[PDB]
Symmetry: C2
Subunit: 511 residues, 2 copies
């Protein structure tokens, strides 16, 4: 019996999962890391703390399994998945980090991004969309790298010596795991930097020159599924816990991992992860799709450097679980997160109340920075139950807008949606989502779809599994899907869609 | 030493107050009555319940006074004040009610009023405003009367017998107090029926014909301040408790009572009552004013049947204290009504959040039935302190809109605003209101300005006081006014006014 380890180095915590060759979860760990916020809107992580947490989770899950399963000796391979966009700077020669990791959601690069938009983009945030598939935005790695060159003298010093390494967290982890001997990134993570040509999947000399980031500072782009490195690190007792030489043969941007782990290999197959926010990705196959509605073009996966590059569309929503936390901690409408659903349940409609969770504006495909958190349609009959129901409905409606845009952009009708993340436990939200979309949702019982993604990449390259088709047969028995079916079928919800449109319009506020 | 009693038969409770000739409150009693809501939007009151509450309050306060002041023998006179618009139908001969009283805020007459607006107003709800000073609306008595002739067979049968009486609560109370012997109303109440010509203060043949209400079903119109009736009922032991023949010589619509009790007798002098809603009235003097901003023209007072008609403009706001109650009971954002102010206090601004309390639309002067309750401008940093502050600010801002419209219509700049009602206890609200208006507010420490109004009417007619400016000198001595001055003198006030304008525009929702 062969085993695949999967590391998931996320925003808030790290998890290590061990799967057998039947894709059964047989061991796992998990530890958080500190969320460092030195100023309003700034977020960074200690990069050595992330590596240490990764090591601790590997060591615990491996040693747990050895204790319970006498025949477990070694992992055949390991795959990795990581928080995207988050950017690390370190020195090739000294091997120290030259600053904390600037996290995807950090806002400190705002002036840098406005400067790019004005000076390079002629005022258009989509000016480079054709080349890299993205939007000029504080989210993407190049803007954090530029920030560091202008705000951290030691980074600028390392650049001038020719010893500066920039990388996403995949590159950082592979650097550390190899003991400083490999400098690579997978193509899914490279697609998130702003600096990769999305058509060729190679570094753009034009985007590197224009953002004043030398190509030589960047990792080598590889596929998701090939030898990255042996684990050479014995930091935390890593090498001795693994016992035998162990190859890292998978690396994937976390949300693309989830797309894989949800078995979304073909054109039209889609997933939405429901957490604090949402990440909705649709696979589009080998023909790239460029959005006409402000969505991202991204790489879904490449399985082997001989295989084709497979593309995705992606959109985001900020006000999902965040809305519920805000309702509890700031508004005190509810004493617990779980009361949202319980109280929303007690009414069958909102009596025309709509909640707009555009706390910092609307994202694509309703792009509008000026929109704010809004409530409409209240009368003296309105109760908190109606408002809480309205807040949940808004999560589903934003998913409807992203998905309808993706369908126009890809030219495909989505027949069902895979759904994961901890907010899929909200049964009322999932039914609302299904009723509004008019299609079934599929919720996996084995929840760790990102980890499974990484494991598939590694296991395919190592020959634990012999093909996608094999992977998908095994998954048919390992991971049962729960199906959520629409209750009223399609459009008895015409009224709510009109109201939702009017609401987004009248939420305009900040300008 | 003379004493004047004042009955205030309000929406949710009745009060009887006894005042001495120095206008000092020397006794009082209060009782609630049931708010009957048989379907959504319907509100009615049991008219015998209102009369019996009235009687009990008089009995109680008379008896307490006799105990504390042994030389008190009788009331010289009694004045009454009443919840306006509220309509009662009864039979002249059997003397029973033919239905509950349909209260001012009831909505059951909605279809009747839509039909009048369409068929008789040609789609203009201000079509008859120049004749009666009002708007075609469910608020006013005539629409309740028409509703009853169409929906209550007993009322229709009484009309056909020649025995049907309709009246406002003033008329009903005088009817009951006289033992069925007088059928009258004061002009301030009659101005709320839709059926009085506001220029002549007589029943309008045209408005009576067009609402299909026979003018003989209506009480005789009188002034606020003359002999209405002696108390002849010994229902509830009333006239036995009064002991001596006691004349009712004052009758005034409640909000107009409050205006008089606040000493607002001259052109430009205004008051706003803060409770569930607000009622803002400004006296305009003998020259009637018609609004160009959707406000009501009404009668302020007529003191004696020879004296002139004095006019007022009036505006209202629904989402005052109702907003605070709603926040507590429906939203559960607060456990106690007093937490609104306590939590709002903890912040100096709303970080740009605005609260629009147009739960059932906007009233004049922002008229818009499509607007709904709205919040705008929230970010993740928004707290309930910011939202509660925004809710209070909205009360003040709606008062600003009413008052600045009134000033344009009356051609007066208001010097100061007298303020009463139980929400004047919210000290933060009062300071917000002052800062936004940029004028002082005057809050009376003797709360009961409506009752005092009714007492003034009765006491002037009975010769207890000789004139309004005597009445006002005595009031300078009895009723201290607390003065709230504008502090925060800002152009952050310009930003909030622009935001408030944008909010009212974006609160549009219902399309009706």
């Amino acid at each position: 019996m062969k085993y695949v380890g999967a590391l998931d180095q996320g925003t808030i915590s790290t998890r290590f999962i061990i799967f057998d060759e039947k894709q059964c979860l047989v061991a796992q760990h998990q530890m958080p890391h500190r969320q460092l916020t030195p100023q309003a809107g700034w977020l960074e992580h200690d990069p050595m703390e992330l590596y240490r947490a990764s090591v601790a989770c590997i060591v615990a899950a491996v040693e747990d399994l050895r204790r319970r399963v006498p025949s477990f000796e070694k992992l055949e391979t390991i795959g990795i998945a990581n928080q995207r966009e988050t950017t690390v700077a370190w020195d090739r020669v000294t091997k120290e980090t030259l600053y904390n990791a600037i996290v995807w959601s950090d806002l400190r690069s705002y002036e840098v991004t406005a400067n790019v938009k004005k000076e390079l983009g002629g005022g258009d945030d989509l000016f480079f969309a054709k080349m890299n598939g993205l939007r000029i935005s504080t989210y993407f790695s190049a803007f954090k790298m530029r920030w560091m060159l202008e705000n951290v003298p030691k980074v600028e010093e390392a650049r001038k010596r020719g010893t500066l390494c920039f990388g996403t967290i995949d590159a950082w982890l592979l650097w550390k795991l190899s003991g400083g001997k490999v400098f690579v990134t997978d193509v899914t993570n490279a697609s998130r930097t702003f600096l990769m040509d999305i058509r060729t999947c190679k570094w753009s000399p034009e985007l590197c020159d224009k953002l004043g980031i030398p190509m030589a500072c960047l990792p080598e782009i590889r596929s998701n599924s090939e030898l990255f490195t042996y684990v050479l690190s014995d930091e935390g007792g890593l090498s001795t816990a693994l016992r035998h030489p162990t190859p890292i043969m998978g690396s994937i941007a976390d949300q693309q991992g989830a797309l894989l782990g949800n078995m979304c290999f073909k054109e039209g197959e889609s997933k939405n992860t429901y957490g604090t926010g949402c990440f909705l990705l649709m696979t589009v196959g080998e023909r790239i799709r460029f959005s006409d509605h402000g969505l991202l073009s991204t790489v879904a996966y490449q399985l082997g450097n001989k295989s084709p590059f497979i593309y995705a569309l992606e959109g985001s929503i900020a006000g999902a679980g965040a809305t519920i936390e805000w309702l509890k901690n700031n508004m005190k409408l509810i004493d617990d997160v779980s009361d949202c659903e319980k109280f929303a349940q007690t009414v069958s409609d909102t009596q025309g109340v709509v909640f707009v969770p555009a706390f910092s504006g609307f994202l694509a495909p309703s792009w509008d920075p000026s929109a704010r958190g809004s409530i409409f349609g209240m009368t003296l009959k309105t109760t908190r139950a109606h408002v809480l129901r309205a807040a949940l409905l808004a999560i589903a409606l934003q998913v409807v807008d992203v998905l309808e845009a993706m369908e126009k952009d890809a030219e495909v009708k989505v027949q069902f949606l895979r759904v994961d993340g901890g907010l899929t436990k909200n049964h009322l939200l999932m039914k609302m989502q299904s009723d509004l979309l008019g299609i079934n949702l599929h919720r996996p019982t084995m929840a760790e779809t990102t980890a499974l993604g990484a494991a598939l990449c590694a296991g395919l390259a190592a020959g634990v599994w012999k093909s996608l088709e094999e992977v998908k047969t095994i998954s048919q028995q390992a991971n049962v899907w729960r199906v959520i079916r629409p209750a009223a079928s399609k459009d008895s919800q015409q009224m709510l869609r009109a109201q939702w449109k009017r609401a987004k319009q009248q939420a305009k506020w900040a300008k």
